[PDB]
Structure 1
């Protein structure tokens, strides 16, 4: 009887729910905050860095925002190992689309593929789901700048500005009351800093705990910039002057 040890992960509950997916969502909501927003100049992704020690190499070390392609990047909230697996898979998917069609994959299509992986895990087999949620931003010539949010169930939805992780309600309120349809890149970055500070329950953000990146489309090319400590510090000085 090996079945006594089975937990039956891919099984409905009396309320028509999946306990494993709910627990993965709890883990994601315990994870650190990751915000994203869309300006008229690009998609901004920010994240709060969880402190481990000051012996961590903080230079050239982005652990909550990753590049999936030249025109797609993502922010992670949940389990880093699961996120790494899914990110490698997404990179493979984007390169496979380019190989098949001689053109770059649309962001919606990539999101659909990775979410299909997640849904298949929740439905087939007897393995646990992925404890990771994604904020996938990108640009393509069909739908312009795009920002998507994906959860462990395989569900995904498009957003103009959103936040995931711990205390995402405060970030969502800040973004709801501040975000505007037409914003410049600098304005969006300042708003991202403000929402990160509010979620972290602080007034003056510290560049040692902030990851900032933005994906823009200029001069016919998509360019991703992952702000360094000094650039984030200049932004924080601007934010301090503003508020």
Structure 2
């Protein structure tokens, strides 16, 4: 997994790969890792995928309840504090590492949360297996006062570095942009550089190839 977040002058972008692996085996070649805590607060996950998904959904539900209670737009600091307190409560046993970006009434926010309950703030962040490779791109190409397209390109290039030079990442690149004045735009498969080449032969078997002992219709209706 390779996830990155980059803040630009008018908001924040996050990006991730789309390769979920069960050990050395690729389980899903198009697993979206960008989750939605709130309509304009998103987060990329790494580590125990089930733990990340579950804590993100729980904090998103509680944040939606909080917004319906306070009649105010959700805030990134609130999701940050709730995630951090829960993770610290379970003493890192929830193996979730998140890069949480968002736009709220207070502005743009980009943070990172670790499984044990620590949080970091920065303009560019990277987490996951390829987090080093992506970071190599970031530290090489990040500057203050980035434009939207500049930050998008930087995040996509960091994710591409994680895809090419890290065995834990690959496939496509998902992006989510959150600008101050607009809605959040979730570009699923923003870049698809790993299209599979056409197979050398078709393996459509001639019907009747498999030996069948007995067939019986099963009534699914009631």
What range describes the TM-score normalised by the shorter chain of this pair? 0.7 to 0.9
Does 1:78 pair with 2:68?
A: no
Q: Is contact 1:163-1:171 (8 Å) kept?
A: yes
Q: Which structure carries more helix by proportion?
A: 1
Q: Which structure carries more strand by proportion?
A: 2
Does 1:166 pair with 2:132?
A: no
1:226: which partner in 2?
186
2:9: which partner in 1?
40
2:19: which partner in 1?
50
Matched residues, number? 186
Q: Distance in 2 between matches of 1:75 and 1:54?
A: 19
Could you tell me which runs of 5 or more consecutive residues in structure 2 were left unpaired when the two chains were aligned.
Answer: 194-222
TM-score normalised by length of structure 2: 0.75
Q: Is contact 1:133-1:151 (8 Å) kept?
A: yes
Task: For 1:61-76, list aligned pairs within 5 A.
Answer: 63-76=32-45
How far 1:176 moved relative to its partner?
A: 1.8
1:211 aligned residue (158, 169, 174):
174
Could you tell me which runs of 5 or more consecutive residues in structure 1 were left unpaired when the two chains were aligned.
Answer: 1-31, 123-127, 235-243
Q: Distance in 2 between matches of 1:131 and 1:48?
A: 19
How far 1:217 moved relative to its partner?
A: 2.4
Taking a change above 3 Å as real, the CA distance of residues 94 and 51 of structure 1, as seen in their structure-2 partners, is closer
TM-score normalised by length of structure 1: 0.69
| 3-state SS in 1 of match to 2:94 | coil
Instruction: Please report the RMSD computed on the Cα atoms of aligned residues, expressed in angstroms.
Output: 2.5
**Structure (1 or 2) with the larger CA radius of gyration:** 2
Give CA deviations for 1:155-198 in whole Å, capped at 9, x if unaligned: 11111101001132232232122111211111111111222222
Taking a change above 3 Å as real, the CA distance of residues 56 and 79 of structure 1, as seen in their structure-2 partners, is closer
